[PDB]
Write a protein that binds this DNA or RNA. Structure first.
Length: 74
DNA sequence: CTGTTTTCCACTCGTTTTT
DNA sequence: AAAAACGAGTGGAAAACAG
C-alpha cells in the first residue's frame, strides 16, 4: 500500500541526516532527540516534490536501513 | 554496583524492482 | 528466471537511567 522513496527524496533525507549528524548518530553523540527527529520529519513532509507523507518511524527506519545496507554517503 | 527503562542494530520476511 | 534492492517487523544487544 505504501509507496517507496524516490531518488530526490532519498537525497533530501540524506542531506537532512548529514546536517543533524551530531544529534541522531550515536557515533557522534560521544538536547531532545525526539524533537530533532520530529524536525526532520516535518522538513521532509513539507518539502514540495514529496511523494507521500511519512511518520517518524518510517523516516527512522530509512535511516537505519540506509546505514545497514551501506548506502548512506555521509 | 543492581535492577529497570530506553535506544540502537543484525537478522529476517514478503514483496517489488533490477540484472 | 535469478538476484538484488526495498519497506517493514522483530528480538536482544547496547546504552542511558534510577536507586
Amino acid at each position: 500500500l505504501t509507496p517507496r522513496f524516490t531518488a530526490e527524496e532519498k537525497e533530501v533525507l540524506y542531506t537532512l541526516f548529514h546536517l543533524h549528524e551530531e544529534v541522531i548518530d550515536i557515533k557522534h553523540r560521544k538536547y531532545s532527540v525526539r524533537e530533532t527527529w520530529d524536525k526532520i520529519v516535518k522538513d521532509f513532509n513539507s518539502h514540495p516534490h514529496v511523494s507521500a507523507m511519512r511518520n517518524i518511524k518510517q523516516i527512522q527506519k530509512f535511516w537505519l536501513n540506509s546505514r545497514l545496507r551501506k548506502q548512506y554517503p555521509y
